[PDB]
From Swiss-Prot:
Disulfide bonds join 6-128, 30-116, 65-81, 77-95. This is Lysozyme C. The gene is LYZ. Belongs to the glycosyl hydrolase 22 family. It is found in: Secreted. One of its GO terms (molecular function) is lysozyme activity. It comes from the Eukaryota.
Amino acid sequence: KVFERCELARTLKRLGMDGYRGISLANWMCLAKWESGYNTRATNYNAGDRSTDYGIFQINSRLWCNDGKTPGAVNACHLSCSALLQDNIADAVACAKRVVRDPQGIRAWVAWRNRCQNRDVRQYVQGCGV
């Protein structure tokens, strides 16, 4: 489903993402924005290494979730990749919290580095009453 901005902000707030490992909600919002445009159905296959990125956070099938067809898959979230294409994002959030427990944190998503790091990201949460 495609979330509306403030609708997603409050959902992430309820699921405990604000300040999780020091990451504000505005930073998770900037990440979902640029990864999928807040769309839970988004997939991106990467023909060079044969992995696919799934859901609102574009979590990759080599390290985090298992789709059965990715070479050298780790499945660190212990989650089927199809759990990340659901309209309910609770599973995508539990796996996103696993990704940032690694030392790189949110820097693991290069799109965050390109689009959100060292920028004013508070316009993503503004007006949502969060």
